[PDB]
With several copies, the nearest count.
Chain A
Amino acid sequence: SNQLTAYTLRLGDNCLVLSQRLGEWCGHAPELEIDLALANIGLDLLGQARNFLSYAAELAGEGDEDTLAFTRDERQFSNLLLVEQPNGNFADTIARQYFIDAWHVALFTRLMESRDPQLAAISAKAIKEARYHLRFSRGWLERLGNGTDVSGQKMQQAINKLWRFTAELFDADEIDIALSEEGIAVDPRTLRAAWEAEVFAGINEATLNVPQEQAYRTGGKKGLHTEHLGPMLAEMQYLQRVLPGQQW
């Protein structure tokens, strides 16, 4: 149940941290239509985090989505390094989003057959949403990469700038594996074929190039984060930290 708790928390944290990032976009997009789309995606993702976190708290026998989100520090947080990357420009947001959406699809499509009933329900919900996300993110990838001269380049650098963090997507530890052998979790390594088949194609149809640099950055799952996470949390948790243990 301890092992299960950490995995569930990981998925929540992935969703939570990314949700946070999208929040910064509110009202700053090139079009009202994008603002709407980004707020919609942020909202969807936040719902999933609550779902994951609420279950993790029930599994741990204490706390709730709020204690978990607001009373942990950056060394306890277990999100992928990718979702904590800064928003940068719209391509950077899109690139980050596309990689995540593609991963979520591969994961949640498969994680909905979990022998764990709560994971299955959470996963059944998330997949329908993730499908929308991928359509939007891939959509924008194609629009930017096969857009103007300038957006094609920005899309390549954005892809380039995020690639190294892709390694973490298929990194497996003893939690993944043990839970995978009980038929409960998905072994991230087996997500590689689908992500690559989607993403390479997605990169391909948009007319862009896959980096040849071997991706090498991991650590988010172990609580070993970039220098980005810390400031994100300071902002996110402030009010709870000043006025702990209250109802809002």
Chain B
Amino acid sequence: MRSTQEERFEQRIAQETAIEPQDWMPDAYRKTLIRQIGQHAHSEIVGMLPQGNWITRAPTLRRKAILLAQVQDEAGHGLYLYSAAETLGCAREDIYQKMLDGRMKYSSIFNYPTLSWADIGVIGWLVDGAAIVNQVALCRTSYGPYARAMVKICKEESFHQRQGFEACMALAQGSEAQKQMLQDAINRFWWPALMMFGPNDDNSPNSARSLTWKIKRFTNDELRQRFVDNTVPQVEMLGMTVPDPDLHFDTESGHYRFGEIDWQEFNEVINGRGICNQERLDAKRKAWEEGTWVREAALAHAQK
């Protein structure tokens, strides 16, 4: 038998009553909200480095400004999510350390390098494209503070996705060289973008409890399919291709059918052995450590 505490909680989730910071929750639920939100916040932070890599090289002042704005927003988004996680009783500083130590994750997509300007536009278009689908889906997540952060965030982020797309359209309507550039970025970011939605429905250990607890409203595979369905026509608009020989439309279901994800690559990535994992964490480690003296100065002045 579930306890009375356990039963009331189940009834609150089922009835869609928002969970608030002062309400009782199961330690595994607390820990799983801390788990997921904390890694969501980290992803906003790490995502600054690949995007930030192209600030000084951005081809026009306008795109450079957009990119700066976008990187600015990510920092702000990290802040909302850290604030939200803290409501669950964790500390911003502690989960950050775990991140730095590799004991917490961040989004797989940021371990991929930006090798061209097109990569910047592709991230804004596809990677944010994938974030939005997932995040809009979380606007009805069972934990109130998280749902409210997602609402706040999706309003602003969809604008920037659009701008990222417009940069892509420019390449698509541009020189031959620009077009080739775009296609390559797509070729390099398509499957990684699909991997942002997580493992298969039968390889996802956190999913069982989360769906039941209505944290995750749609399965990883469900979200991935919606994105593919939505994004293929955007690829078509650009006159571009998807690097997937098995991609084809299925009239019977009304959906796009696509090839198997390289799950072996994905597992490499999450255990720290992708392309930029080491560089990303080193950069973050270096920022923290070399910054120590600034924070200590800051603390001593605060005290005065």
User: Which residues of A are interface residues toward B (Cβ below 8 A)?
Assistant: 20, 23-24, 26-36, 39-40, 42-43, 46-47, 49-50, 53, 65-66, 69-70, 73-75, 89-90, 142-144, 146-148, 150-151, 154, 164, 216-217, 219, 224-227, 230-231, 234-236, 238-240, 243, 246-248
Contact = CB atoms under 8 A, between A and B. Distances in A.
Majority-rule SS of B interface residues: helix
B61 A66 contact: yes
Contact of B78 (A30, A32, A66): A32
Contacts of A66: 60-61
Given A46-B68, A219-B275, A151 B53 contact: no
Nearest to A36: B75
A238 B288 CA distance: 31
Nearest to A154: B293
Given A227-B114, A246-B178, A31 B291 contact: yes
Given A27-B287, A39-B68, A227-B114, A246 B174 contact: yes
Interface stretch (B6-14, B225-233, B253-261, B296-304): B296-304
Contacts of B69: 43
A246 B72 contact: no
Majority-rule SS of A interface residues: helix
Interface of B: 45, 48-50, 52-53, 55-65, 68-69, 71-72, 75-76, 78-79, 113-117, 167, 170-171, 173-175, 177-178, 184, 268, 273, 275-276, 278-279, 283-284, 286-288, 290-298, 300-301, 304
18 contacts: A23-B55, A24-B56, A26-B55, A26-B71, A27-B52, A28-B286, A29-B287, A35-B75, A42-B68, A47-B65, A50-B61, A65-B61, A73-B116, A75-B184, A89-B290, A216-B268, A226-B113, A246-B59
B200 to A, nearest CB: 24
B115 A74 contact: yes
Nearest to B297: A147
A1 to B, nearest CB: 23
B113 A143 contact: no
Contacts of B62: 50, 248
Contacts of B115: 74-75, 224-225, 227, 230
B68 A43 contact: yes
A33 B72 CA distance: 10
Contacts of B65: 43, 46-47, 50
A157 to B, nearest CB: 11
A227 B34 CA distance: 32
Given A146-B301, A216-B273, A27 B49 contact: yes
